[PDB]
């Protein structure tokens, strides 16, 4: 998260990255020369990388998808209707209506005229979903429901900050006696 | 198997002087088998070339800085860093 | 010359060498944060507020026709009093890349102490000067009328003779000088021939007609040298007219920070010597009508950590008042990455 440095260090590699993206390589392989052409997809990059190179507020923001720029309210409104229109040349352009603010708007309303792009992006990454952490994100969330499901908060809401501990002190508790499933503080795969 | 050099030695000459035969093979044999396997070894041609990019061929572990400026009248910087050029290094992984 | 060390909050992490602490009518305000405009201050521009030694970092909100401008690290600025405003040229953008923009900060609403800033921007035309970092703009009047020179610092290599193995590495500009018009904003760019070398980080001073170039590291060849530059800047109805003199009694300095204690009367606060020359003493710019008196003052008194650092940084809060910086203790671990002072000039 030391931007500075980060892309100090990583524009010579995105700039012989944009060059070799236009050429053809001339290679002897085995006797015979072959001409290999090539095309890139940087998609391992986790969520906040992800939020960070290519230009995006960090995670706690109103803008939730890195694939759809759709607020965290309005995406409970409607769960799955949504379509992939986060792109990097949209984005470098939205960085440019911002840094210009051409319409002449405030600071909240030039954010929604933008979704939250307030840097500009320094790699070019794809629209994807990271499965694992995908995958840890979503048992972390089931091992909150599974609280708050013992909590009984259904009918009775907003217990302390102790009661939850209490309820998590049982849940583990019992996972530790039917399962021999050790807790852990540290959510793993 | 995360051998050393040192201990690679070790079990080369063991193996050498008990059994008479050398099966293992010396450390010298294994660098000028390793310099095969690194970039910067193969020649290689782009068409068009490269735009600012260099032409050698031979350009093994770069500095991963990139040249930066240095000194006590720029901005800090103490990351020590290491890196392989691209192109070489997607032309050694494809032989 | 009472240097004070000062405490800091919560977003200490905000600072960062090459900053930047613009002053309008008696008030400071912080710019050129460390990494983009993060969601709490969406400007980076902040009430720099010193109270009991204790300063708050406070966010600023900009006017409705403003042009959010990203934190540069080593800009050049001027105070353009001429409706009080401030000039930004070049720097160092939060992705390592260098900015040809010209901002210019102005105050279109201020009431109950919130100021509402007003960061409109303005291109050149003509002699542009290619972007760079490190060098110095300054204002300079003559025949009621007023123009910008430009001294330029270092840049990276051009877009030809840029290569990936060497691609961060730096190079001092052309010793041109460029004269901007801020009205039109047109560039125009002269040839010196009594200066040759490049120069960075150097230390210049606007005195109504004229500008005193000093100290300025040279990438070049890499030595300080001391020897200071007088620019003569006419202004006739037709074309303007430079001038250069070499002068006496300069100082081998670069990241020298300047301010002005008393009307045309200035102090240079610590720069360096060489490489590894933590500089100390200070140095009086009793200015004249055409003459630069240099001198120096008791060097003011410096603590341990401070001879025992490296490096600094830090800029002048307006009122003969310095601001400086120093990195943490590597050994002593449990350090907040920075301690900080503020020494007045009085
Ligand atoms: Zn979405």
């Known amino acids: 998260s030391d931007h500075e440095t980060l892309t100090a260090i990583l524009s010579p590699l995105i700039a012989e990255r944009e060059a070799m993206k236009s050429s053809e390589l001339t290679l002897e392989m085995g006797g015979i020369p072959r001409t290999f052409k090539f095309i890139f997809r940087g998609t391992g990059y986790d ?14 923001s109103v803008y939730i998808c890195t694939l759809c720029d759709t607020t965290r309210l309005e995406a409970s409104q409607n769960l799955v209707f949504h379509s992939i229109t986060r792109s990097h040349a949209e984005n470098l352009q939205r960085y440019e209506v911002w840094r210009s603010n051409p319409y002449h708007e405030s600071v909240e309303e030039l954010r929604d005229r933008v979704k939250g792009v307030s840097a500009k992006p320094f790699i070019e990454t794809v629209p994807s979903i990271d499965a694992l952490h995908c995958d840890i994100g979503n048992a972390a969330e089931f091992y909150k429901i599974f609280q708050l499901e013992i909590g009984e908060v259904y009918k009775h809401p907003n217990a302390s900050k102790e009661e939850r501990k209490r309820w998590q002190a049982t849940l583990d508790k019992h996972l530790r006696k039917r399962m021999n499933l050790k807790p852990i503080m540290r959510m793993n795969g | 198997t995360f051998l050393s050099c040192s201990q690679y030695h070790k079990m080369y000459r063991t193996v050498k002087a008990i059994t008479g035969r050398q099966i293992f093979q010396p450390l010298h044999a294994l660098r000028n088998a390793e310099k095969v396997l690194l970039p910067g070894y193969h020649p290689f041609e782009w068409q068009p070339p490269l735009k600012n ?14 040249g930066l400026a240095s000194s006590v009248d720029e901005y800090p910087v103490d990351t020590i860093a290491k890196r392989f050029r691209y192109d070489s290094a997607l032309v050694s992984a494809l032989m | 010359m009472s240097l004070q060390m000062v405490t800091v909050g919560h977003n200490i992490a905000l600072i960062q060498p090459g900053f930047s602490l613009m002053n309008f009518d008696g008030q400071v305000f912080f710019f050129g944060q460390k990494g983009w405009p993060k969601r709490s201050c969406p400007t980076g521009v902040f009430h720099f507020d010193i109270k009991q030694n204790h300063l708050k970092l406070k966010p600023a909100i900009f006017s409705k026709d403003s042009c959010y401008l990203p934190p540069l690290r080593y800009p050049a600025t001027c105070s353009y009093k001429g409706k009080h405003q401030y000039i930004i040229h070049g720097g160092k953008t939060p992705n390592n890349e260098l900015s040809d923009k010209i901002y210019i900060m102005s105050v279109a609403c201020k009431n109950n102490k919130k100021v509402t800033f007003r960061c409109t921007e303005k291109d050149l035309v003509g002699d542009v000067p290619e972007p760079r970092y490190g060098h110095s703009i300054d204002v300079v009047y003559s025949r009621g009328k007023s123009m910008g020179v430009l001294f330029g610092g270092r840049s990276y290599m051009p877009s030809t003779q840029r290569t990936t193995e060497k691609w961060n590495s730096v190079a001092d500009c052309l010793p041109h000088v460029f004269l901007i018009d801020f009205e039109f904003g047109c560039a125009t760019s002269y040839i010196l ?8 980080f150097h230390v210049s001073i606007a005195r109504n007609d004229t500008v005193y170039i000093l100290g300025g590291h040279s990438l070049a060849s890499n030595i300080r040298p001391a020897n200071l530059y007088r620019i003569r800047v006419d202004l006739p109805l037709g074309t303007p007219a430079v001038n250069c003199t070499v002068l006496p009694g300069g100082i081998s300095v670069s990241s020298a920070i300047l301010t002005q204690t008393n009307n045309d009367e200035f102090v240079i606060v610590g720069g360096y010597q060489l490489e590894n020359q933590k500089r100390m003493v200070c140095s009086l710019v009793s200015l004249g009508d055409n003459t630069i008196e240099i001198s120096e003052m008791e060097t003011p008194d410096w603590t341990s950590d401070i001879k025992h650092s490296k490096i600094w940084f830090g800029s002048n809060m307006g009122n003969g008042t310095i601001f400086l910086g120093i990195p943490g203790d590597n050994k002593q671990a449990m350090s907040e990455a920075f301690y900080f002072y503020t020494l007045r000039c009085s």
């Open chain 1, 47 to 60: 969520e906040k990388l992800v939020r960070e190179v290519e230009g995006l507020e960090a995670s706690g």
């Open chain 2, 53 to 66: 990019v260099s032409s050698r061929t031979d350009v093994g572990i770069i500095d991963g800085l990139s």
């Open chain 3, 193 to 200: 021939p009594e200066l040759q070398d490049g120069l960075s």
